[PDB]
Design a protein around this ligand. Structure first.
Ligand code: HS3
Ligand code: CA
Ligand code: CA
Ligand code: CA
Ligand code: ZN
Ligand code: ZN
Length: 158
């Protein structure tokens, strides 16, 4: 489907979850973008004002799209593929408890997956892939994309 047709991509953090330290949200999101810039020609920059390609939002329940959140558990996050407006945006359910670690729901791991969607990836049927639709914590310090994830993204970029 749709892909970004340019190499310099911007993101903006709309608002911050109270679940985490501000600096930890910034770093988790930055690291998640880095996972994908590692394996593509894309470059990501955080902007603090204006219209970004990818808007990162924390919200609960109904939040202005057709995809209301469902309280704690179930749907953790969702995102929209490349395009104008809502295209590229990544939304995280504030009814989850976001963390830097194995507790609650890990923001970095979830963001890697969601940014995958923001870049145009769909779901994998392979449980080993970060793009598998089910959340399962893995050690974030040693995290690596699966072969399936790399094949997927390199079918779109580079
Ligand atoms: C590892 O990243 C994620 C991100 C979200 C989810 S999820 O919310 O439980 N499942 C949703 C619904 O299909 C999903 O894939 N959202 O992008 C599961 C794992
Ligand atoms: Ca939820
Ligand atoms: Ca957008
Ligand atoms: Ca929360
Ligand atoms: Zn949404
Ligand atoms: Zn998904």
């Amino acid at each position: 489907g749709p892909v970004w047709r340019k190499h310099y991509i911007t993101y903006r953090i709309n608002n911050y979850t109270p679940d985490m330290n501000r600096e930890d949200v910034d770093y988790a999101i930055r690291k998640a973008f880095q996972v994908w810039s590692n394996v593509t020609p894309l470059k990501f920059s955080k902007i603090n004002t204006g219209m970004a390609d990818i808007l990162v939002v924390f919200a609960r329940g109904a939040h202005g799209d057709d995809h209301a959140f469902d309280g704690k558990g179930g749907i953790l996050a969702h995102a929209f593929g490349p395009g104008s407006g809502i295209g590229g945006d990544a939304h995280f359910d504030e009814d989850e408890f976001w963390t830097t670690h194995s507790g609650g729901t890990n923001l970095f791991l979830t963001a890697v997956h969601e940014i995958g969607h923001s870049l145009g990836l769909g779901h994998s049927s392979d449980p080993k892939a970060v793009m598998f639709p089910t959340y399962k914590y893995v050690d974030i310090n040693t995290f690596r994309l699966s072969a399936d994830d790399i094949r997927g993204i390199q079918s779109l970029y580079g």
